Amino acid sequence: AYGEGANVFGRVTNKSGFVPYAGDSFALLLPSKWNPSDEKEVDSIVLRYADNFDAVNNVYVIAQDTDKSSIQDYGSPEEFISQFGYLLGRQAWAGQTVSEGGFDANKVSSAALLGVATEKDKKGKTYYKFEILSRTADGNEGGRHQLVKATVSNGKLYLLKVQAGDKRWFKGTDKECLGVLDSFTVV
Amino acid sequence: EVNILGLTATALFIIIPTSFLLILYVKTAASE
Amino acid sequence: EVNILGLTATALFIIIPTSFLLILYVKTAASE
Amino acid sequence: ERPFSDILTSIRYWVIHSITVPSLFIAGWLFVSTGLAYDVFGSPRPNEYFTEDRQDAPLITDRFNALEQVKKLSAQ
Amino acid sequence: GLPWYRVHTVVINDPGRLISVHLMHTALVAGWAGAMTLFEIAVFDPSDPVLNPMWRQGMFVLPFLTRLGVTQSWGGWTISGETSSNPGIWSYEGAAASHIVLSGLLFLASVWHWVYWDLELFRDPRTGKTALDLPKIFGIHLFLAGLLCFGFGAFHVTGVFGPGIWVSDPYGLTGSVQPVAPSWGAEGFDPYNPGGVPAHHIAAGILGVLAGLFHLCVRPSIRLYFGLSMGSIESVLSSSIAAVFWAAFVVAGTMWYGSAATPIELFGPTRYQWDQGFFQQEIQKRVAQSTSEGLSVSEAWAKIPEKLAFYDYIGNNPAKGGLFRTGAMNSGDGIAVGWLGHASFKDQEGRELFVRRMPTFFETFPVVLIDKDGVVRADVPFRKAESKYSIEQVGVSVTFYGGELNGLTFTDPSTVKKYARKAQLGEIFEFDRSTLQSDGVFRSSPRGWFTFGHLSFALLFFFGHIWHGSRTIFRDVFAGIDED
Amino acid sequence: IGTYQEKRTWFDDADDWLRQDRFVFVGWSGLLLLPCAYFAVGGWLTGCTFVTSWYTHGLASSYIEGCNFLTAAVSTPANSLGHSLLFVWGPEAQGDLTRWFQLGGLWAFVALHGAFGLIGFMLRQFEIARSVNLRPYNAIAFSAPIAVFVSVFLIYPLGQSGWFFAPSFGVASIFRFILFFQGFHNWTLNPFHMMGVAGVLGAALLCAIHGATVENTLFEDGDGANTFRAFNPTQAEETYSMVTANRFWSQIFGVAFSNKRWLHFFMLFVPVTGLWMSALGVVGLALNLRAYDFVSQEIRAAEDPEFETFYTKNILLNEGIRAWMAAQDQPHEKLTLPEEVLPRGNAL
Amino acid sequence: IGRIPLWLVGTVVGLLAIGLLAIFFYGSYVGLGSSL
Amino acid sequence: QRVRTVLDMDDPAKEETVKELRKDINN
Amino acid sequence: MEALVYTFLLIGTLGIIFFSIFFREPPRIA
Amino acid sequence: MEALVYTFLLIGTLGIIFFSIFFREPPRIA
Amino acid sequence: IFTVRWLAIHAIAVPTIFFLGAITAMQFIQR
Amino acid sequence: GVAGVFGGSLFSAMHGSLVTSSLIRETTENESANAGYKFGQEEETYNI
Amino acid sequence: SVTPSLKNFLLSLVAGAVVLAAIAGAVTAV
Ligand code: CLA
Ligand code: CLA
Ligand code: CLA
Ligand code: CLA
Ligand SMILES: C=Cc1c(C)c2cc3nc(c4c5[nH]c(cc6nc(cc1[nH]2)C(C)=C6CC)c(C)c5C(=O)[C@@H]4C(=O)OC)[C@@H](CCC(=O)OC/C=C(\C)CCC[C@H](C)CCC[C@H](C)CCCC(C)C)[C@@H]3C
Ligand SMILES: CC(C)=CCC/C(C)=C/CC/C(C)=C/CC/C(C)=C/CC/C(C)=C/CC/C(C)=C/CC/C(C)=C/CC/C(C)=C/CC/C(C)=C/CC1=CC(=O)C(C)=C(C)C1=O
Ligand SMILES: CCCCCCCCCCCCCCCC(=O)OC[C@H](COP(=O)(O)OC[C@@H](O)CO)OC(=O)CCCCCCCCCCCCCCC
Ligand SMILES: CC1=C(/C=C/C(C)=C/C=C/C(C)=C/C=C/C=C(C)/C=C/C=C(C)/C=C/C2=C(C)CCCC2(C)C)C(C)(C)CCC1
Ligand SMILES: CC1=C(/C=C/C(C)=C\C=C/C(C)=C/C=C/C=C(C)/C=C/C=C(C)/C=C/C2=C(C)CCCC2(C)C)C(C)(C)CCC1
Ligand SMILES: [Fe+2]
Ligand code: NA
Secondary structure, three states: OOOOOOOOOOOOOOOOOEEEEEOOOOEEEEEOOOEEOOOOOOOOEEEEEEOOOOOOOEEEEEEEEOOOOOHHHHOOHHHHHHHOOOOOOOOOOOOOOOOOOOOOOOOOEEEEEEEEEEEEOOOOOEEEEEEEEEEEOOOHHHOEEEEEEEEEOOOEEEEEEEEEEHHHHHHHHHHHHHHHHHHOEOO | OOOHHHHHHHHHHHHHHHHHHHHHHHHHHHOO | OOOHHHHHHHHHHHHHHHHHHHHHHHHHHHOO | OOOOOHHHHOHHHHHHHHHHHHHHHHHHHHHHHOOHHHHHHOOOOOOOOOOOOOOOOOOOOOOOOHHHHHHHHOOO | OOOHHHHHHHHOOOHHHHHHHHHHHHHHHHHHHHHHHHHHHHHOOOOOOOOOOHHHOOOOOHHHHHHOOOOEOOOOEEOOOOEOOOOOOOOHHHHHHHHHHHHHHHHHHHHHHHHOOOOHHHEOOOOOOEOOOHHHHHHHHHHHHHHHHHHHHHHHOOOOOOOOEEEEOOOOOOEEEEOOOOOOOHHHHOOOOOOHHHHHHHHHHHHHHHHHHHHHHOOOOHHHHHHHOOOOHHHHHHHHHHHHHHHHHHHHHHHHHOEOOEOHHHHOOOHHHHHOOHHHHHHHHHHHHHHHOOOOOOOOHHHOOHHHHHHOEHHHOOOOOEOOOOOOOHHHHOEEEEEEEOOOEEOOOOOEEEEOOOOOOOOOOOOEEEOOOOOEEEEOOOOOOOOOOEHHHHOOEEOOOOOOOOOOOEOOOOHHHHHHHHHOOEOEEEEEOOOOOOOOOOOOOHHHHHHHHHHHHHHHHHHHHHHHHHHHHOHHHHHOOOOO | OOOOOOOOOHHHHHHHHHOOOOOOOOOOOHHHHHHHHHHHHHHHHHHOOOOOEOOOOOEOOOOOOOOOOOOOOEOOOOHHHOOOOOOOOOOOOOOOHHHHHHOOHHHHHHHHHHHHHHHHHHHHHHHHHHHOOOOOHHHHHHHHHHHHHHHHHHHHHHHOOOHHHOOOEOOHHHHHHHHHHHHHHOHHHOHHHHHHHHHHHHHHHHHHHHHHHHHHOOOOOOOOOOOHHHOOOOOOOOOOOHHHHHHHHHHHOOOOOOOHHHHHHHHHHHHHHHHHHHHHHHHHHHOOOEOOOOHHHHHHHHHOOOOOOHHHHHHHHHHHHHHHHHHHHOOOOOOOOOOOOOOOOOOO | OOOOOHHHHHHHHHHHHHHHHHHHHHOOOOOOOOOO | OOHHHHHHHOOOOOOOOHHHHOOOOOO | OOHHHHHHHHHHHHHHHHHHHHOOOOOOOO | OOHHHHHHHHHHHHHHHHHHHHOOOOOOOO | OOOHHHHHHHHHHHHHHHHHHHHHHHOOOOO | OHHHHHHHHHHHHHHHHHHHHOOOOOOOOOOOOOOOOOOOOOOOOOOO | OOOHHHHHHHHHHHHHHHHHHHHHHHHHOO
């Protein structure tokens, strides 16, 4: 390799904890600690990054070819997230249970909506923003926080989805999850 | 597939009295 | 029931060396 | 017999050790600071861990062409 | 008196009773060989040579008998599936009975040498005291060993007088005892070349005969005699033990890694064959060659032999059993009775998934089904409440293309998950677990048991050699220096 | 030798030079032990300082990358390299040193030189014991560390897929190896390992008890308050009261030593026997012949949803070690397992 | 012989070793390996 | 026949295959 | 039996150590 | 085994009678 | 001098001082 | 603590080896070398 | 023919002989 001197009295080149990523008509600041992973749950996923510590803390974007011109044409944002109640993962258990505690009858998972927004960045196209607390009957990570930023630019729906366990969310991964959320800009 | 209970019975019935008699004969012949 | 193979192995591993050591101790203590 | 007590007390030891020990320390310092440790022992620099093609942990996955492959996926 | 750990030292300066105790040990070993062979013949089931071979039945000395030529028994059967021709005197039971008769004769010779120990042959004519000319004894023994090595390599294994040795297919499909032509080139040092064994034994026998003649004719030097204590039997004990565990380490290594002297059809497959996908790669190559030229699926897979699919199965892995999982491999997970076929899995829209095979390190492994490209597409999840990978929502179907299941496609129930879990172990096989009341946990191969016993014995004999070399170099201080 | 003329050769002069009292003894064994041991320790200190592990393991294990003394290590080669001896001139490195460091060849260098250094050291013990005319019980005792080293760093990786599963020379590397044996082999459940643990704990107990007993039966031998200067090597009397020690331990423990011969032979015997049993156990683990399970317990718990033992808890813990450790432990296996198929308890 | 006191030499070497260990412990909080 | 397909055929089930570990420089 | 063998072995070991404590050979030479 | 045990017992009896015939104690007092 | 004591002592001492200087240099290396 | 038990086994082996090795002849290849003198003398054996 | 691995191994044998000769020279010196 080429010979160059070591870094002495040369300061540090990265402290923000966020590295830019430019993709197919989208750009976002990924967490610097996180690393890429080739695990496509939904086939529409084009980019996926996950935490090296705990892979529940993960982020991915989907590039779904769509018909509706603008995100407002998907109706109310509630109507939009009702359509997207499939990328949360349906329960693989079908047995009867009234013993979960704090859940509906025969159910072992629940999702609570905590945010509904129509944020804008630079052009005028609106961004549907959502926060969802997903509580599973086992209580893993104390629940999972799903932050969704969705829009369509040309003819493809671009939906950010960062995941964070409630255990890590209370520790302080909220800053990085919200940083990815605000840095997802579709250009 | 081997009658090992009978094998154990035959082997023990051979080993224990033969060893007992051999030990008695050895201790008798050692001290005349 | 009953693991007769394990029973035979444990019983033999107890009986044979204990009897061998006891016979050695008896013949040692008999002739000082 | 020099039982290691008289030599450490004598100044003849420290006259020739006021140059050799600091020179070795400076030599190690320059060996690190010039990148020669990276060049000799093949350790990557902090900016030379992930190439544009692969962004994950490298894998050798070959034996008889390991030299050629490690030259391929090293930091050029 | 003597301590219990010293009672065998009474025959150090007694060559006749040393010969007696060597004869006693030799009689015990030969009697064990005969009795072990008869036990394995009594518990052996020769009905299915393909799907229930000897290494699946816990056979230990039968592969070693087979490797050098005996194949048929007095019962009229042969391990190759052929019905027996005339076995002569040298069948399995005949060799066992010969070992038993040899054991009795050696017992009688041991008794004679115990009683008649004060033979003038063991007495030095020059001084009158008891002594052994150990360099000359070594020369005689090396000459005899070289003669035996040369005879075994030039007459037995080459087939000019003997039967030969076991030569098999590279994938262990067809194998038999055949004469072997020696390989005198560099290929003769190929461990998997069967020709390197006659060439080795011929050359080593010639060289051993030459070295035995040299030791018969030439006396050692005084410096080397005093340095190695050649007048002492404890020094040759240490050196012999050293050579013995060297050979034990060598045989354990060749046992574990496989060789031409370690046939797959006799000792089972290899853990490196499982890890490196030997049988799996050959099966896939055969299926691809049949599918690319003519024969379609479900009939190309029928061309796959039953033995090869049995080799491609982690239950035949020697590195999968346990230390106290005792007995035959059949007693572990049943006697194999048939090959259900190749479990092929498809998605709901249609693409072939593959169950990730279990490595040897894992007592248990997660059941995942991943794509041709290398991306996880389905699994049998633990949590069963998340993502898009559970079987019941991916919608994979298993088709099967083999013997009992040739066109039976299962898509809806948990039988798909069960077949995926069975497919992570390799080729799915039908097992009978009621004949031997089988356990369920995998057992070890005779190859693994041989390797474990010999490596443990090799380290124990390393300690024994170190102790004996200590004792023979330090004889003056182990006995006494008398205040000086 | 033996009342002979014995005209001198080069060997007599070489033996006379090598067998001399110096600052450090050399001997014939020093022709092997000194270079092999120096190269082993120097290679370990060099690999812990400069040689990376990014190529072979995909991790940082050196001081030039940000690792501590407890963290940096000389890492094993990649599993795809198998049991290759990894010579510099070999087909892998092909005479290229800076890639030989990157290919994990330093581990093979350090391991082979350490093995030959152990051989040379116990040869040196033999040579010094022969020079001073003493029995080589030190060599007999040192046979057990050599056995442990051989079975752990040679026999186990030769039984496994390759040198990759050998212990990397370090601290956190050894901790990884230990946790790997817990999760994959159930090494605590192995009776040979139990014998080794008993041997080491009993040897430490024997050392502490013998030292305390001798220091507490030291006799007067002087007038000062410091008993250490009360000792004289010239005198022919024992420095401590064996009768008093025997009576004390007979009335405290029930049994006591009456022979210094037997006491010190027991002190030699216990750790050597323990380490040899542990070496035999690691040899058993080299072929995955592990005492992992209890069949009766597992069948009982399979047919009974109520039956639980600490052994079943340990089995469940081993499953989690394997599942959550394999993906980042074995990069050759390419285990991209999703988080849902990995086992979890409740809420953690 | 006896020009510089042995206790003074050992004391100076002790301060140098303590200072080197202090640099080593300080480097665990800055630069590489500082987790930041 | 298809050495590229059979290499990818054995790619998902087992990553330790000889056919994969040899000539992996070109891939 | 399963637990009976374990109990027998444990009480045999306890009896051995009891005999070693109380019915030992009296110590001689120091 | 089945026939091996019978053969072992028969040859053991034959060896015992052979030893009784040949290696007996010498007949003292008449 | 250059005896066995000198050779052993310096073969231990020289690379240790070189490596200690190297490590002290690496203490101030920042990413 | 790990270094302590490992070093305890090390030092126990070293002490046992050094005291079991440093002897003058008082026990022969038999049970004892009492031919010089039987039990009942204070002439000590051993070496340090 | 002579494979490069064989040529490198023969060069390694020569190098090992050189190292052994150097060690012998060093111990004949001093
Ligand atoms: C190194 C020689 C060797 C090897 C490699 C084998 C290998 C094998 N034998 Mg074999 N055997 C041998 C010598 C050997 N044997 C000898 C010398 C005898 C005469 C006693 C036998 C008699 C024999 C019989 C009767 C049988 C076998 C069987 C088997 C197969 C089943 C696995 C097994 O052994 O169970 C497990 C092995 C172990 C658990 C090893 C024990 C581990 C250590 C040494 C135990 C420690 C001892 C401990 C201190 C004692 C305390 C225990 C006490 C409480 C009971 C296997 C391939 C079986 C078979 O398949 O039928 C053909 C069968 O039934 N063998
Ligand atoms: C007339 C003599 C004779 C014959 C023809 C046989 C024949 C046989 N025996 Mg056998 N045996 C004999 C005597 C004999 N034995 C005696 C006297 C004993 C008591 C010690 C034994 C104990 C014995 C056992 C325990 C076993 C057999 C077994 C067998 C069968 C397979 C042998 C095999 O493949 O193993 C391979 C043989 C070897 C690997 C020997 C290799 C010799 C080493 C490599 C020598 C190396 C050191 C040498 C000194 C170096 C020389 C230097 C060189 C330059 C010349 C076979 C039918 C096996 C069997 O299946 O049971 C029936 C079995 O396990 N025998
Ligand atoms: C072919 C190899 C071989 C041979 C010929 C000998 C021969 C001898 N050894 Mg030795 N030894 C060996 C290997 C061998 N050893 C190994 C491998 C080890 C390491 C474990 C040792 C460790 C050893 C020690 C520590 C000592 C000897 C001693 C002795 C001498 C007599 C003591 C004696 O045996 O009394 C009788 C022995 C017993 C009654 C042992 C009881 C039976 C044991 C516990 C179980 C036997 C297992 C089973 C029945 C046999 C299967 C084993 C086989 C498959 C290998 C004698 C000349 C002693 C000595 O130096 O002389 C003063 C001594 O103290 N040996
Ligand atoms: C003198 C002590 C000594 C010893 C015992 C070793 C031992 C070892 N070294 Mg090492 N080495 C040493 C010194 C030593 N080294 C020195 C001083 C250096 C610095 C130059 C090295 C640098 C070094 C490197 C870089 C490597 C080793 C490696 C090895 C290992 C394998 C070597 C091998 O396979 O080739 C075998 C060597 C021989 C068989 C010796 C050849 C003897 C010849 C045939 C004698 C013939 C001459 C003949 C008498 C000439 C007259 C005949 C003529 C007139 C016709 C091995 C255990 C390798 C390793 O660590 O593995 C990963 C490796 O990579 N060494
Ligand atoms: C982790 C435990 C452990 C260590 C570190 C250790 C260390 C040592 N034991 C010695 C002796 C002994 N130890 C003994 C019994 C025991 N030793 C034990 C456990 C240990 N013993 C146990 C449990 C026993 C009881 C059986 C005896 C009986 C002796 C001695 O007589 C001997 C001595 O004289 O003590 C002063 C010393 C001389 C060795 C030497 O120079 O070899 C020369 C060879 C060398 C230096 C090359 C080997 C290099 C090694 C094997 C591979 C490379 C490793 C790197 C250099 C370092 C890696 C470090 C990381 C793993 C952290 C050495 C300090
Ligand atoms: C219902 C019941 C009973 C429940 C219990 C169930 C249960 C848990 C069972 C326990 C199972 C059990 C027994 C486990 C042990 C199994 C196991 C691991 C066995 C290891 C076997 C083995 C062969 C190991 C090989 C290694 C080996 C040889 C170890 C031996 C260890 C050992 C005996 C150490 C010595 C211990 C000891 C107390 C030393 C005595 C020290 C002492 C009193 C010195 C006295 C003394 C000191 C002086 O200095 C002087 C001067 C004098 C004069 C003097 O006198
Ligand atoms: C209230 C008192 C509390 C203590 C009571 C408990 C102490 C138990 C006594 C120790 C065991 C006796 C050892 C017999 C062996 C015996 O009596 O040998 C006798 C021996 C005495 O040896 P000598 O000095 O006489 O040796 C010279 C001889 O060769 C010549 O006679 O004792 C010792 O070796 C020293 C002590 C070792 C004791 C080792 C402890 C072993 C632990 C046992 C654990 C059992 C398993 C757990 C139970 C399931
Ligand atoms: C006299 C005579 C005879 C013969 C007889 C017989 C029949 C014999 C035999 C014999 C036999 C039939 C033998 C066998 C045997 C056996 C053995 C010898 C064994 C063993 C053992 C061991 C060695 C073990 C070990 C071990 C243990 C301890 C446990 C388990 C594991 C192990 C392995 C470790 C006749 C009449 C013919 C004729 C001539 C004369
Ligand atoms: C690699 C290699 C080699 C080898 C080399 C050598 C052999 C050398 C060396 C070296 C060395 C040898 C180095 C070193 C290092 C060291 C160090 C780095 C140290 C330290 C640190 C510390 C931290 C310390 C501390 C302390 C202690 C603990 C003790 C006392 C006190 C004090 C404080 C000082 C060669 C080239 C041949 C080639 C092949 C490979
Ligand atoms: Fe003492
Ligand atoms: Na839980």
